[PDB]
Design a protein around this ligand. Structure first.
Ligand code: FES
Ligand SMILES: [Mg+2]
Lengths: 215, 100, 135, 57, 225, 44, 14, 26
């Protein structure tokens, strides 16, 4: 009863058969979730559209992922991944930002329990690749405790609304390193030209930052 | 003063034997199927030897025999394979029976 | 309610997480035992990959100093007509008896290789050992 | 992604982080450095990382 | 009122001891060496995930490091004993037909279950249909051989993980231990190795069941008075 | 491999061409793609 | 949440 | 450390490579 089901795609697939010619079947993609981090998806196939719904939603509840959420409202860090030809870039956002994501991502995020996130989908916009690509990226996000345990250092959150106050979000359970993390004068991290072009005011789009209904 | 594994391995008869090709070893028949003799000789895999024509009835379960080893494990990698195919048996030639 | 995503984490991580989310009402019978006495490696699915270029397995061949003596003994005298008995854990072959004498004479200060090998054969012949040279 | 190694160097934020603003006397700066040698590594990183910031300021 | 004390004195007490059943007295590196457990397959058959547990190659024959086997075997036996103590269903699985009869007898003698036959599709993932909606599945699956007869991973390895069942498995040098919860690097082919494994698990399981009865009986006698 | 197919999953299976195997065989079973190959090559 | 029509009648079984 | 550990070296039991009947002849 705690799980909600949402449809992501309903397709009519046509199979050519030896004696019966073109036959019509239904392929349905549905996602399930309880709104508290546990969510999954499954494909359903049947000749009738309502049998596909039953198979998909019942099967999905047995293939649930657990998704870690920062403060139970957003992701722990920016996630950029490619699944086949579908690219998804997700950004951690503060409270009140809402879900500014592909409508399918919005639907899945309400099932997971993510309230604030930005996502941009590039390349092929295949609902299945997008769905399983999204769950792959959300299931491989490193939490703050995992980072602290991995590096044996404190994770300190600096918020501009809280000024210079250092907020320790996670501390290692094991011993605490004494050697500071090396401060490489320049990081060799790869950047997204889309993110940089926006921060420099060179991104011009009539479709960006448009007023939309609450999501 | 507990013996280490490195010590057990160095002084093991199987380690001391070196290569197995053309090595005389004593085996024991543990299973027989018609004229197929299954003989263990101290290795990982048993060998399968056909009952000799002469004194065939002398070869029974428990009979200790002399073998000339060829390979401890018959394996080969075939074209287009990522690993080796193994038949899970050693290659040995049955010479005769061991007697005191 | 559960998870059959066997390639996503491990049975422990999937069970622990679904227990936290309240999806699983009761913990499985094994969960408390795994938690107290976990394996050395957490059982997470991995895909075996093939090595390419300059990548090589780290496994090393097992060799011993006496193996040089064993190769020469087999070359000079061949495999002994005596049969190996690999069932007896204390079996000593003619080669091992040769190696032990060869090691004893080396510890007596002799350092030449060709000379240390001929004197060893004589000692065994004196002890009654049969050493038929292959050629 | 942004082409090249250390794409951060090609951002306005990075270029504005230079702290060297030369006095009006400075008219020309020549840099002589070596592509190989362990003792000239700092000069190579200076050309690689900091020359862009100096010219920007 | 009385349940919390029961679960604490019986179910939680064994979990506070490093070796509650003393399974380390059951084997030694020498006992494993005499059973030929260190003997692995040829190097050409090596699985890359088994390289951590391999001591080396002796003339193109891989040797399993028994120092690690002893530590893994300690964990595997300890887990098996705790699951037998908790009255868990232990299922032995192996497709090697040389040992099918031996394994079925070992299971019957210890009071557990064996599946050495052709594993049918969906025995674990479709058990309710095949057996009934109230069928109880195994709490622990012990693999004495992790490969099937075509040298591929036994289907039950994947299906055990799907059903969140922990697996104990003897993993030779050509096997894949990634999804086996408690792997034990060791020879699975030699009759002496396989016989040893059956004695250890049989003994660990039998001791744990007797320990459960001893504790329960004492807890009841003390409860009345 | 070559254009000649060698992807068979049971490539390591032991080929057993005997009279007894034929009797202990599923009647539904039909010859696989590379099953004829072993026959074509064994006859040669 | 919404309702899907039920697939079959449970009496239709052995 | 330990005397019984394996030592690194070249295969002492390695056999010579095969040779054709005319190997080494003009
Ligand atoms: S093998 Fe032919 S020249 Fe040497
Ligand atoms: Mg094996």
């Amino acid at each position: 009863e705690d799980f909600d089901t949402r449809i992501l795609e309903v397709r009519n697939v046509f199979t050519m058969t030896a004696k019966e010619g073109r036959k019509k079947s239904i392929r349905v993609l549905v996602a399930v979730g309880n709104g508290k981090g546990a969510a999954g998806f499954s494909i359903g196939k049947a000749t009738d559209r309502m049998d596909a719904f039953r198979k998909a939603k019942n099967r999905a509840v047995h293939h649930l992922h657990y998704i870690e959420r920062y403060e139970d409202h957003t992701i722990f860090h920016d996630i950029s991944l490619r699944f086949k030809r579908t690219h998804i870039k997700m950004k951690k956002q503060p409270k009140g930002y809402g879900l500014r994501c592909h409508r399918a991502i919005i639907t899945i995020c309400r099932l997971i329990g993510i309230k604030d996130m930005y996502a941009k989908v590039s390349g092929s916009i295949n609902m299945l690749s997008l769905t399983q690509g999204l769950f792959r990226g959300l299931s491989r996000q490193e939490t703050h405790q995992q980072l602290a345990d991995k590096k044996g250092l404190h994770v300190v959150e600096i918020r501009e609304e809280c000024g210079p106050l250092p907020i320790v979000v996670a501390s290692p359970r094991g011993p605490l390193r004494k050697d500071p993390e090396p401060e490489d004068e320049v990081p060799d991290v790869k950047l997204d030209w889309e993110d940089v072009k926006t921060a420099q005011g060179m991104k011009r789009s009539v479709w960006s930052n448009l007023k939309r209904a609450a999501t | 003063n507990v013996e280490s594994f490195a010590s057990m391995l160095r002084h093991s008869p199987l380690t001391q034997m070196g290569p197995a090709k053309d090595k005389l070893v004593i085996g024991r028949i543990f299973h027989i199927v018609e004229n197929d003799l299954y003989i263990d000789f101290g290795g990982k895999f048993h060998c399968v030897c056909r009952r000799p024509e002469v004194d065939g009835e002398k070869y029974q379960k428990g009979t200790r025999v002399r073998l000339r080893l060829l390979d401890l494990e018959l394996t080969s990698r075939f074209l287009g394979a990522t690993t080796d195919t193994t038949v899970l048996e050693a290659n040995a030639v049955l010479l005769g029976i061991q007697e005191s | 309610a559960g998870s059959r995503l066997e390639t996503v984490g491990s049975i422990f991580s999937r069970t622990r997480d679904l227990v936290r989310a309240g999806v699983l009402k009761e913990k499985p019978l094994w969960f408390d035992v795994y938690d107290a006495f976990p394996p050395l490696r957490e059982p997470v699915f991995q895909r075996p990959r093939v090595r390419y270029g300059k990548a090589k397995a780290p496994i090393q061949d097992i060799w011993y100093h006496e193996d040089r003596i064993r190769a020469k003994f087999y070359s000079v005298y061949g495999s002994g007509q005596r049969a190996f008995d690999l069932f007896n854990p204390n079996f000593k072959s003619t080669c091992q008896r040769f190696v032990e004498k060869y090691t004893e004479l080396q510890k007596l200060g002799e350092t030449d290789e060709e000379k240390l090998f001929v004197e060893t054969g004589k000692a065994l012949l004196a002890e009654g050992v049969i050493l038929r040279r292959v050629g | 992604p942004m082409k090249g190694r250390f794409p951060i160097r090609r951002t306005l934020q990075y270029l504005s982080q230079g702290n060297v603003v030369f006095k009006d006397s400075v008219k020309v700066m020549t840099v002589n450095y070596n592509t190989h040698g362990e003792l000239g590594e700092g000069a190579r990183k200076f050309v690689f990382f900091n020359i862009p910031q100096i010219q920007y300021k | 009122e009385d349940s919390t004390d029961f679960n604490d004195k019986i179910l939680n007490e064994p979990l506070k001891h490093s070796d509650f059943f003393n399974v380390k007295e059951l084997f030694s590196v020498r006992s494993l060496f005499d059973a030929r457990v260190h003997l692995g397959h040829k190097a050409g058959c090596r699985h890359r995930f088994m390289e951590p547990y391999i001591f080396g190659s002796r003339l193109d024959h891989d040797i399993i490091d028994l120092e690690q086997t002893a530590t893994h075997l300690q964990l595997a036996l300890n887990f098996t004993a705790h699951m037998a103590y908790r009255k868990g269903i232990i299922l032995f699985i192996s497709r090697n037909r040389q040992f099918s009869y031996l394994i079925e007898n070992m299971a019957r003698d210890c009071g557990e279950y064996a599946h050495t036959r052709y594993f049918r599709g969906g025995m674990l993932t479709n058990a309710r249909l095949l057996f009934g909606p109230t069928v109880r599945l195994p709490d622990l699956i012990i693999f004495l051989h992790t490969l099937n007869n075509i040298f591929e991973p036994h289907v039950a390895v994947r299906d055990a993980a799907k059903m969140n069942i922990p697996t104990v498995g003897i993993v030779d040098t050509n096997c894949n231990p990634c999804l086996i919860t408690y792997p034990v690097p060791g020879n699975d082919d030699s009759p002496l190795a396989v016989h040893l494994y059956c004695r250890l698990f049989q003994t660990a399981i039998t001791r744990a069941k007797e320990k459960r009865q001893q504790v329960e009986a004492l807890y009841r006698l003390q409860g009345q008075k | 491999k070559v254009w000649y197919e060698s992807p068979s999953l049971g490539s390591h299976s032991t080929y057993k061409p005997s009279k007894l195997e034929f009797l202990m065989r599923s009647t539904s079973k039909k010859t696989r793609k590379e099953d004829h190959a072993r026959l074509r090559a064994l006859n040669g | 949440a919404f309702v899907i029509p039920k697939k079959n009648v449970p009496t239709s079984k052995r | 450390s330990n005397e019984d550990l394996p030592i690194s070296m070249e295969n002492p039991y390695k056999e010579p490579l095969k040779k054709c009947i005319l190997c080494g002849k003009h």
